[PDB]
């Protein structure tokens, strides 16, 4: 049911997508769904990427 709440209308401090475009996320369907988010503090080395 939910979209556009933080997809566009939020203070994007950092928002980086791989394999997909942020603006196209409202038209897609996801399988084996995690859509989960991992809540951590992660120090400050902002190199969480492939």
């Amino acid at each position: 049911a939910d979209y556009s709440v933080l997809y566009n209308s939020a203070s994007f401090s950092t928002f980086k997508c791989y394999g997909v475009s942020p603006t196209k996320l409202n038209d897609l369907c996801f399988t084996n769904v995690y859509a989960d988010s991992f809540v951590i503090r992660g120090d400050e080395v902002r190199q969480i990427a492939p």
């Binding site: 394999g19 997909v20 475009s21 603006t23 196209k24 038209d27 897609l28």
Partner: peptide, 14 residues
Amino acid sequence: AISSVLNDILSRLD
């Protein structure tokens, strides 16, 4: 490539 279908690439990606 990420997929073998042009429609998926065009839908998912800029």
